[PDB]
Ligand binder design. Sequence first.
Ligand SMILES: NS(=O)(=O)c1ccc(CNC(=O)Cc2ccccc2)cc1
Ligand SMILES: [Zn+2]
Length: 257
Amino acid sequence: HWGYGKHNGPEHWHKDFPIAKGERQSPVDIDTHTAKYDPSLKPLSVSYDQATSLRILNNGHAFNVEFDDSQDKAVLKGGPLDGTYRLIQFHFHWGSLDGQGSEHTVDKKKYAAELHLVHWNTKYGDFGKAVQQPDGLAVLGIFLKVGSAKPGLQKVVDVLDSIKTKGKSADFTNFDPRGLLPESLDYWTYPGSLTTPPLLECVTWIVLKEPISVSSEQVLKFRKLNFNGEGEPEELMVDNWRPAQPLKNRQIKASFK
Ligand SMILES: NS(=O)(=O)c1ccc(CNC(=O)Cc2ccccc2)cc1
Ligand SMILES: [Zn+2]
């Protein structure tokens, strides 16, 4: 099946998922000088105070921290969005080296990792319906650079030992995703897709300008995870990122100048 290796990675995906070469694929390079400031953009509303995390899962491609999305407890609204988008999960993409790992790039610059907080539009009722819609998803993307540690990330890195291999899950309640956000909510936004198969073109991407910093020890712990299942040959979960895709007929908008 698809993955991130030489024989099943991003260059192969189009054979099973032809939309890989579609009109609104993600990630993209954000050319800061060509992004258009849009004063018609409302401020972002991140409402995570009632967030209820449930579980953390190694799915063989990344690890997901899952939330209760059966009511409006943690939602994203405003910005470019119309309506209410419910937080379902967050996950990261990261590199084998500090100089690569993010999916979006900024003036071709790669960050060490990228956080994706995935939300779905409540007017579609469930996540499965949402991904079939052009405005079904809103993913909040946050770059990570290596430097000082991120205290709000530590609880996540300390549980990774318990989900080392594909298919492992562990209880992960009472985690506050507000601890992963930078100070500023200045953002760029563009219409794109899921960055893994099925690569559906259902995402309003909202990528924050300000990266968060994580420590070298923190990202090293990401790199100790496994793509494989228990009892299978060890393949380190690193470089689980999709490179930048053609922008084509899209303008990236900025919330700030
Ligand atoms: N990296 S990203 O933030 O763009 C990203 C990628 C994949 C997904 C998950 N998509 C699927 O698992 C498939 C699926 C389809 C229909 C019902 C359920 C699942 C979420 C977010
Ligand atoms: Zn992602």
